[PDB]
């Protein structure tokens, strides 16, 4: 139902895209209040004929570094009977691009950044706000598009702010200090320090510090182990197919209370 007969390519090739959103709510005492990963695998293929495919990943059930999938669904092309009976993912794919699988995880997530805030209320007219970020992943990988958003009080008079890497700006319109870093390798750390002058009132209610980032790995811990291909009439296998995988991990709602 998913694929027309008679497809022919000179170059048999496929691309797997592992796309994940990592979500966190962290207490000021470094307690994880909530975390999850929403993931999907997108397959784009140019395969001749009616290839029989198998997708292998580091699922705990077949490997007992393996991962706990809480829930998943698959494209209609996947044989659910074989996933229930063997934990095998077996299909004849659509041609071109489709979403093979979508999944959710909560256990043993790699939280790519640790956010360590320090807030000192000095008098009733001054706040000192410091944040350290630490990249918790291999030193050979680069995070990119890093943003740290630090909320400011509605009675902010002025901000002075410096940081050890990247650039930071007070955006009064957004009641935030916005810290941007273009790239940061794993097992690194940086720091921002702000002095917030406050307007005196008679008599703070802090939102969380949020991050944006992209990392070149699955924070679920998902690794693609194989994509087996067999076309029985054309008699080509794996060895005849050029195969690629990319991992893109993005922040979703990634909040650390201060």
């Amino acid at each position: 139902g998913w694929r027309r007969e008679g497809i022919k390519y000179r170059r048999n090739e496929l691309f797997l895209d592992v796309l994940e959103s990592v979500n966190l709510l962290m207490s000021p005492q470094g307690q994880v209040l909530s975390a999850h990963v929403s993931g999907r695998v997108v397959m784009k293929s140019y395969l001749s004929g009616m290839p029989e495919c198998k997708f292998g990943m580091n699922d705990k059930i077949v490997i007992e570094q393996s991962i706990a999938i809480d829930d998943c669904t698959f494209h209609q092309c996947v044989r659910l009977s074989k996933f229930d009976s063997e934990r095998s993912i077996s299909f004849i794919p659509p041609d071109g691009e489709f979403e093979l699988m979508r999944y959710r995880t909560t256990k043993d997530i790699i939280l790519p950044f640790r956010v360590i805030p320090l807030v000192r209320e000095v008098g009733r007219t001054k706040l000192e706000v410091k944040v350290v970020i630490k990249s918790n992943f291999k030193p050979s990988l680069l995070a990119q598009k890093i943003e740290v958003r630090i909320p400011t009080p509605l009675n902010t008079s002025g901000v002075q702010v410096i940081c050890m890497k990247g650039k930071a700006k007070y955006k009064a319109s957004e009641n935030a200090i916005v810290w941007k870093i273009k790239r940061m390798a794993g097992m690194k750390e940086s720091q921002i320090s702000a002095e917030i002058e406050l307007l005196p009132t008679n008599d703070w209610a802090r939102p969380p510090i949020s991050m944006n980032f992209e990392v070149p790995f699955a924070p679920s811990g998902l690794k693609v182990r194989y994509l087996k291909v067999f076309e029985p009439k054309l008699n080509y296998s794996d060895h005849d197919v050029i195969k690629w995988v990319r991992y893109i991990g993005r922040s979703g709602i990634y909040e650390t209370r201060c």
Binding site: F15, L16, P216, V224, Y226, L227, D238, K243, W244, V245, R246, Y247, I248
Partner: peptide, 10 residues
Amino acid sequence: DLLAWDPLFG
């Protein structure tokens, strides 16, 4: 960024 694509061998 094509450097983000890794080969799948086997």
